[PDB]
Amino acid sequence: DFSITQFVRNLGLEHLMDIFEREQITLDVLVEMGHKELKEIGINAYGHRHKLIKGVERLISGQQGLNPYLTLNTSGSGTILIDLSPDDKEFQSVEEEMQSTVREHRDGGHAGGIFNRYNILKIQKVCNKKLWERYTHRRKEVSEENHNHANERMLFHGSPFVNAIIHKGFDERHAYIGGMFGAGIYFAENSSKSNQYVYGIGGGTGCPVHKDRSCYICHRQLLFCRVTLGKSFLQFSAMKMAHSPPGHHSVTGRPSVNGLALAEYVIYRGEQAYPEYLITYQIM
Amino acid sequence: DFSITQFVRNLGLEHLMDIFEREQITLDVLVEMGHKELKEIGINAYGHRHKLIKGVERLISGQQGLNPYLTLNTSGSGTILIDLSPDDKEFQSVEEEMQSTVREHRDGGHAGGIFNRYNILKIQKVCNKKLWERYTHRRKEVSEENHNHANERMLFHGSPFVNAIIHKGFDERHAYIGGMFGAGIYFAENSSKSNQYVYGIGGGTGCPVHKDRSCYICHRQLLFCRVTLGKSFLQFSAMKMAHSPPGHHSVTGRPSVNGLALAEYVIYRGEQAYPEYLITYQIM
Amino acid sequence: DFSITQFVRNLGLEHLMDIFEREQITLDVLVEMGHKELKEIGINAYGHRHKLIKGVERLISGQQGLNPYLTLNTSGSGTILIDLSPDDKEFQSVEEEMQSTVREHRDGGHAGGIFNRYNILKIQKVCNKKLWERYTHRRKEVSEENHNHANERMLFHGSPFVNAIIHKGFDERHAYIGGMFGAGIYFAENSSKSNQYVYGIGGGTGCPVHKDRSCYICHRQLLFCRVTLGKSFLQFSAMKMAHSPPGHHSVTGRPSVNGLALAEYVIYRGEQAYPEYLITYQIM
Amino acid sequence: DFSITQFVRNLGLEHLMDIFEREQITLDVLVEMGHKELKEIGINAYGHRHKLIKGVERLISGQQGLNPYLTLNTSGSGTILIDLSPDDKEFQSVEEEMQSTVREHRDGGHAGGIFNRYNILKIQKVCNKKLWERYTHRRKEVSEENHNHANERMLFHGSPFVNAIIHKGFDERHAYIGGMFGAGIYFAENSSKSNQYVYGIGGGTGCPVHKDRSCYICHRQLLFCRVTLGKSFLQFSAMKMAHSPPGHHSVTGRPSVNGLALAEYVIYRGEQAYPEYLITYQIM
Amino acid sequence: DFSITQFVRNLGLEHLMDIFEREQITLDVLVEMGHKELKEIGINAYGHRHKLIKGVERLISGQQGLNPYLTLNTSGSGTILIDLSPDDKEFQSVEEEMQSTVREHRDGGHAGGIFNRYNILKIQKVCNKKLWERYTHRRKEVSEENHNHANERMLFHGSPFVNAIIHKGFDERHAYIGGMFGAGIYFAENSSKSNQYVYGIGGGTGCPVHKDRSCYICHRQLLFCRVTLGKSFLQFSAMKMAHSPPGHHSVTGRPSVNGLALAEYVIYRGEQAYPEYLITYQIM
Amino acid sequence: DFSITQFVRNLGLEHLMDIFEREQITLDVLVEMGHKELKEIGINAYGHRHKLIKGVERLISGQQGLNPYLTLNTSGSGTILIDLSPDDKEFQSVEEEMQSTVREHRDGGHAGGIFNRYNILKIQKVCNKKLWERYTHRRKEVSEENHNHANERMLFHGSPFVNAIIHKGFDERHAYIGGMFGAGIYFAENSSKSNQYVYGIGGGTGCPVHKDRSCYICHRQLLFCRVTLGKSFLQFSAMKMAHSPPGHHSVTGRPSVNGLALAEYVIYRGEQAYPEYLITYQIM
Numbered sequence A, B, C, D, E, F: 001d002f003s004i005t006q007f008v009r010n011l012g013l014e015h016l017m018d019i020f021e022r023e024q025i026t027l028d029v030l031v032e033m034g035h036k037e038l039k040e041i042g043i044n045a046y047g048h049r050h051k052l053i054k055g056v057e058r059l060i061s062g063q064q065g066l067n068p069y070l071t072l073n074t075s076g077s078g079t080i081l082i083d084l085s086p087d088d089k090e091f092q093s094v095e096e097e098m099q100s101t102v103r104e105h106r107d108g109g110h111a112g113g114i115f116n117r118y119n120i121l122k123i124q125k126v127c128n129k130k131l132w133e134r135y136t137h138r139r140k141e142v143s144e145e146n147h148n149h150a151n152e153r154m155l156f157h158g159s160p161f162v163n164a165i166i167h168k169g170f171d172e173r174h175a176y177i178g179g180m181f182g183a184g185i186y187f188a189e190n191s192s193k194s195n196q197y198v199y200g201i202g203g204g205t206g207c208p209v210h211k212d213r214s215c216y217i218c219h220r221q222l223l224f225c226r227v228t229l230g231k232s233f234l235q236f237s238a239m240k241m242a243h244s245p246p247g248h249h250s251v252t253g254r255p256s257v258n259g260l261a262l263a264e265y266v267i268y269r270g271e272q273a274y275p276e277y278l279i280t281y282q283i284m
């Protein structure tokens, strides 16, 4: 609330401050205004506008190494959630993909509970510009390294730290270090497989209110995520690795020899996934 | 050059014709020129430029029902093949995809021949704006209908009508009538599976010069294509169908239950594929 | 105010003055206007614009040895402080670096006070174009002399003359003449070490209001500065020098052979530091 | 040269082919030519130039999803080695840094050999635009995460795959799996420490000719690399980790708690290093 | 000449190497050649010139952070000495300044010897572009701080390290630590005063051949140098200072209250002096 | 011949020294040679010529403030005397002007001797480029101050220091301090009036050999000079002045109010005269 005042005073234009006070113009807003906008708010003299624009250019480009623009353009960042209408076709498609991918697991529903279908309470689209740009830059890199094909899938992820993921993104520094394929981020085609991990490895201690892994009351959260696979190394046996195999961008495992079990995937770089949808649900 | 001659004479500006003759300005060029370009070629009077621009607007927009613009923009349409360099990363990626997917088939090299490796002679990128736009429009549709996921893949296709495909695109009216899944366009993850169909169904009669289905001299052509699958229906048994199952956009099957065999896919709409790469090769 | 009037009168264009009065055109603004801008403000005749531009050229380049351009462009110079938002990641990074580098000192908090952590009230980015350009010119010089590596760090600085530094820059003519390594400017990796000098050498006489070196009420200020080290000379014992050792660009010392104590640095040229961040804080 | 032939024929401009043949204009050259350049080579009619430029626009931008520009822009990529002048100050700086950091090791020169000085045969600057762009993009990211500070250093790296590194960059998929700090890329401030790894871990089996780990004849190669550390976690005990600690961008450790030993660093992402200098040398 | 070979091979223009071999075109020469120069040496096709120029741009600007241009542009740097003709007025002026400023000293010729006149053997102009540019940059900087006045003087300097100065420039890291005004660089208006230091402090031990401080046979060397004083602080008593007083750019003292003794000056920054003339002489 | 040796060595082109030694190329010659001349002397490779020309540019223009060109370009300066042919009309015109302006004086030939005629032994043209350019620059100035009219005359000057004048030019620092019009340089329309000063004021003591003011044996010398008068002030009485009257460029007086006596002129700036002809003669 004072950087604008100093900037204007350094140019000898303090007589304009009243205008800038009535229009609630701050330095971050000012640096994005040209002749037309300044004319609109009431800066009628050409000389004053010329001085303001030159000062802004000297601040933003003259001292780029200090990155003042990043310091000014923090507002508006962050994540928001947009609720999908139940009657919408997108909501129906996500719900169908969630429900039709339930399957029996070798454990008798110990990790995630016993159930045959879900009860979806709401689905939210996660919007974060910085995370999305990170994901798209990595996706373009992988495409260029894989004959112009990103090999992008839509997979499931279960975690007790869903909030941290949606607000900060996927991070290989928080990988499943004890995973069967090494220290990476794991995604499942089957909804129930990811649901198993919602409360922690092996289901953790269940819901925080009743400590029941098969709780039918507490709300649960899953992530339906856009995952870039690139050239995916197909692995049949257990093998612990820290990064991707040379020349590859992810790992694909099919633990079930036959049946209805779908594939599982591992990525060793957090920027290769984006949490597009946050699903809130119960089991039945 | 008579179209522009009539257009200019109608406006009463025939005295400018000499300029248009020296600059090789055809009506298709003229309909895209504004004040800046007309000033560039030497139409210095504002009145003449105004008359020309008003006439172009009267013709193009004023009679949009006749679509004169479409009849003027036939120049430049068509396919171009851009050769990839063998030393480039794209060429190496595509060649590795071709080589690593070879496998044995139930027939003892009857349709495709006997071989373990290819000799890649050249790979070309297929560029066609109209076909690409048709494919992109269909892909956007499918994504909108499949929770913002096109489910795009890169798959091989073999056919004796490669030239027709690269100049006209994929057509469901030229579908495989006798296919095990019905009348549709078929793609394979294994390069050898598509190589089986290079000369026709079941290998046809082999190359046109030797009539040999395992000729190691004659050049063969395969397509590595961008295929939009959307929501695919999983098929385990032969079923003759004309279109995709309700609610789905393609069909995926696996004739080989287990082994090195990869999946096969069928689309019942030609616009859902694009022939990105054309590979010329020999079998060894 | 009368400079532009004299300039315009000397050209015989006094009849234009009314325009320049309405648009608040001063000579400093006018020396930066070409044909486009003069046309924008209403100088329609080409001859008038030509005369004005030639007159500006004659003043600025014709008498370059008098440097009128500098005499005209003093406006807009000076320092502005851009306030970081606490919710921003840059603010969090700076606060974490400040808080995580506190440590015990040989004196029982005599110079700085008894505390284990701070209370940050605000952090500001210091923006001064002339000082930044001086710093970057020197940094490029040192890089050219050190195999293209500036060896640049971020280090803490405490001083009772913080305002003079942020407005005028670092100046070796105001060096710490009595320092253990000679007459230079001293920086610390540990924030508490720099805090020891906030009120003067050895803590001075404490806060101005209560004269307490361990005051928990008065606001304190620190600088987190960008320091170019280049080829740094490692010193193990006290040695008073006036300048850097031959062939080097700074001095680094480690008074404590072990423990959490971090390194300390000395530069002998004021242009090798830039005070990027100004931190206002209390101790607890 | 058939790509440009097809492109020109599609536009109905085959009569220009003669010019394009004499000036050695390929499609990759053509897509970069405007009105000025086309006029330079003798395309004098405005309409022909307009058609060519519109066709280039319809290819490069109309089919952006196919990425034809990347297909055409593979020429000029790759690495060049620029020899430094032994009389130049850059060569002398690099050699002084290499020589002044030799020291003794716990093993009596078992891995790197027995010597106290090098014989520098040549030093080369490694130039690769794509790798440099990848490095600078990552450096910008890290700086934005670390209060505008990359924390960049110059460190030595020894490896038997130096050619692969200088032609393809640093790859964490080729990390030191059995390292003391886990699967990462390791750098040393002491040149002798990195020299210990020139022929392999623990010196391997020595030079390829004499099988001697202390050969004084065979030429060795070291890399002097630009390494971005960002926020570096300080490690005192061996821990096998796959990625950086949460919130940090690298790891720094000192196996020798005292003496003449300098620090060692580990990065868990290959894009955070760039091989700036290639040094060819002999031990003495 | 392998750098240009790699550069040309990466562009696919190796067939041009013959030309580059006959014209002795190295990469440093090539990065300075446009269309005109390339046409001069016989690159007649426009496409080849276009590729070469684009490659040079991608190197020099695309990888600016690596500074390839400075690596390529070390040739021709360094000092040259131009002999003045004894018949020209420049030589006569320098000699008159040398001769007319001799005087008696407090010690009876103990340090510099006993003489009234010199025998001037030769006078040379010292030319070094890098050092001159450093000097002029500092001179501009000082003038801007001293109301557009550098306060430049011509002063004598005597030192046993004249060669190091003329090849590397004046350096405050090699200051006169024990001088009466502190650690700086000292200059005199009297040539005899500087002659007292040609062999070291207090004359050292005289000529290297006779060990005679008053040798009339062995050749001596003085520097007549451009010195920027800016705002000079007037000192009347000995005072040991490391840098200039605040607000000043040099110090001036007059040890003799009155008489034939002229002033003496001290600068504390090496870039404020330039060694314009090198005088070789004998005392008589 | 070592300046060119250093210059060529710094460029790494010492293998060309042989050529430069055979063609007697010195640095002053080299700084004036382009591609054409270097090709003429046998520098056949374009790269070598390019390097030489760039080095010359970096010396002459890069270090202009040192003025290396003036140091290199002293050769050829100085005066030459061109004898006039006694049969040519220029000699005859000068002799006629000399003879026709003799007259009687208030003293009976006391200062210049007794005679009616001269014996002209020779007349020479004085050629000095530096002095001529000084004269023409001043003439341009005076014309611009006097409505485009220099007011240039041809006048006689007698002086015992003719040699100094013809080698160094006219100098108002060597003015006739005791003259009737003040401290200026005096010229006469009568040749006998100037002859009165050939041996000094009032004739001095006479010729150096016979000490005779009317010697008929010894050779005398007069100057016939181009004098710029500009706006001349008419002075009727003796009045000592140091400079011209305000607004004027010279003074004209007529001591004899009537008869065969012509006018006399005084300039107060040495650069307003040029000594065009040197006349050697005897009085008869």
Ligand SMILES: COc1cc(-c2ccccc2)ncc1C(=O)Nc1ccc2c(=O)nc(-c3ccc(C(C)(C)O)cc3)[nH]c2c1
Pocket: A156, A157, A158, A159, A160, A161, A174, A175, A176, A177, A179, A180, A181, A186, A187, A188, A193, A194, A195, A197, A200, A201, A235, A236, A237, A238, A252, A253, A254, A255, A264, A265, A266
């Ligand atoms: C490639 O996947 C596998 C392959 C094999 C195999 C074995 C032998 C042969 C062939 C294959 N066995 C097991 C897995 C597997 O574990 N897959 C999944 C699937 C979903 C999630 C999931 O939704 N979430 C977390 C999660 C998330 C966070 C965390 C914490 C928060 C603890 O970091 C831990 C696990 N892990 C998964 C892991």
Ligand SMILES: COc1cc(-c2ccccc2)ncc1C(=O)Nc1ccc2c(=O)nc(-c3ccc(C(C)(C)O)cc3)[nH]c2c1
Pocket: B156, B157, B158, B159, B160, B161, B174, B175, B176, B177, B179, B180, B181, B186, B187, B188, B193, B194, B195, B197, B200, B201, B235, B236, B237, B238, B253, B254, B255, B264, B265, B266
């Ligand atoms: C879904 O795919 C199958 C499934 C089963 C199955 C059977 C039982 C149970 C479960 C599954 N059996 C066979 C196939 C199969 O034939 N797949 C392919 C794979 C590649 C190509 C190919 O590259 N090209 C043409 C082609 C191209 C052009 C033409 C025309 C009609 C143009 O000649 C005909 C066939 N067909 C393929 C067909």
Ligand SMILES: COc1cc(-c2ccccc2)ncc1C(=O)Nc1ccc2c(=O)nc(-c3ccc(C(C)(C)O)cc3)[nH]c2c1
Pocket: C156, C157, C158, C159, C160, C161, C174, C175, C176, C177, C179, C180, C181, C186, C187, C188, C193, C194, C195, C197, C200, C201, C235, C236, C237, C238, C252, C253, C254, C255, C264, C265, C266
């Ligand atoms: C290289 O640094 C040292 C080395 C050794 C040593 C001793 C033995 C062996 C090996 C090493 N001992 C002490 C220091 C030291 O004094 N370090 C610092 C660290 C921070 C600041 C700081 O933030 N501020 C001012 C400041 C600033 C301004 C002024 C005034 C305004 C008085 O000019 C005075 C001191 N000095 C520092 C000084």
Ligand SMILES: COc1cc(-c2ccccc2)ncc1C(=O)Nc1ccc2c(=O)nc(-c3ccc(C(C)(C)O)cc3)[nH]c2c1
Pocket: D156, D157, D158, D159, D160, D161, D174, D175, D176, D177, D179, D180, D181, D186, D187, D188, D193, D194, D195, D197, D200, D201, D235, D236, D237, D238, D253, D254, D255, D256, D264, D265, D266
């Ligand atoms: C962080 O560094 C260490 C810390 C500790 C420690 C232990 C306990 C406490 C505190 C600290 N112990 C050992 C190291 C260490 O190994 N340092 C280095 C230093 C240089 C190179 C080097 O130049 N090159 C390769 C290389 C390069 C390539 C390869 C491959 C796998 C490609 O062959 C393997 C190793 N490794 C280094 C490794």
Ligand SMILES: COc1cc(-c2ccccc2)ncc1C(=O)Nc1ccc2c(=O)nc(-c3ccc(C(C)(C)O)cc3)[nH]c2c1
Pocket: E156, E157, E158, E159, E160, E161, E174, E175, E176, E177, E179, E180, E181, E186, E187, E188, E193, E194, E195, E197, E200, E201, E235, E236, E237, E238, E252, E253, E254, E255, E256, E264, E265, E266
């Ligand atoms: C400001 O100058 C003085 C002032 C007073 C004074 C004392 C009291 C009151 C008022 C004034 N007393 C002495 C000096 C003085 O020492 N003047 C000079 C004059 C010329 C040279 C010179 O040509 N060269 C080196 C040189 C050069 C190189 C070296 C090294 C260290 C490189 O050997 C040492 C001395 N010193 C000078 C020193």
Ligand SMILES: COc1cc(-c2ccccc2)ncc1C(=O)Nc1ccc2c(=O)nc(-c3ccc(C(C)(C)O)cc3)[nH]c2c1
Pocket: F156, F157, F158, F159, F160, F161, F174, F175, F176, F177, F179, F180, F181, F186, F187, F188, F193, F194, F195, F197, F200, F201, F235, F236, F237, F238, F252, F253, F254, F255, F256, F264, F265, F266
């Ligand atoms: C404007 O001239 C006069 C005006 C009046 C006057 C008095 C009252 C009223 C109105 C007018 N009276 C005398 C003179 C006069 O002295 N005229 C000349 C004419 C020629 C030469 C000449 O050729 N040479 C040297 C010369 C040259 C060199 C030197 C030095 C000083 C170098 O020895 C001295 C005199 N003086 C002249 C002097």
Ligand SMILES: [Zn+2]
Pocket: A207, A208, A209, A210, A211, A212, A215, A216, A217, A218
């Ligand atoms: Zn519960």
Ligand SMILES: [Zn+2]
Pocket: B207, B208, B209, B210, B211, B212, B215, B216, B217, B218
């Ligand atoms: Zn055949």
Ligand SMILES: [Zn+2]
Pocket: C207, C208, C209, C210, C211, C212, C215, C216, C217, C218
């Ligand atoms: Zn207080």
Ligand SMILES: [Zn+2]
Pocket: D207, D208, D209, D210, D211, D212, D215, D216, D217, D218
């Ligand atoms: Zn060997």
Ligand SMILES: [Zn+2]
Pocket: E207, E208, E209, E210, E211, E212, E215, E216, E217, E218
């Ligand atoms: Zn001697």
Ligand SMILES: [Zn+2]
Pocket: F207, F208, F209, F210, F211, F212, F215, F216, F217, F218
């Ligand atoms: Zn005589």
